[PDB]
Amino acid sequence: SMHPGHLKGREIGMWYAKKQ
DNA sequence: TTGGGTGGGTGGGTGGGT
């Protein structure tokens, strides 16, 4: 409800690698 | 043959690889 999760690859790593 | 640890693992492996 806050993170993508549906992303695959650097897509999610560059979306918020800052975890949460 | 579909990224890498020049990002992290109280994001996850019902996402893929080193």
Q: How far apart are CA A17 and CA A13, in angstroms?
A: 5
Tell me the two tokens of residue A14. 């560059």
What long-range pairs does A2-8 form, CB within 8 A, spacing at least 24?
none
Which protein residue has its CA closest to C1' of B7?
A17
Which residues are within 8 A (CB) of A16 and not within 5 positions of it... i.e. 6 or more apart?
A: A3, A4
Footprint of strand B on the protein (CB under 7 A): A 3, 5, 7-10, 12-13, 16-17, 19-20
Residue A18 to residues A12, A14, Cα–Cα distance (Å): 10, 9
**CA–CA separation, A10 vs A8, rounded Å?**
7
**Distances, alpha carbon A9 to alpha carbons A2, A3, A5, A6, A14, in Å:** 18, 14, 10, 10, 9
| Interior angle at CA A3, CA A20 and CA A1, nearest 5 | 110
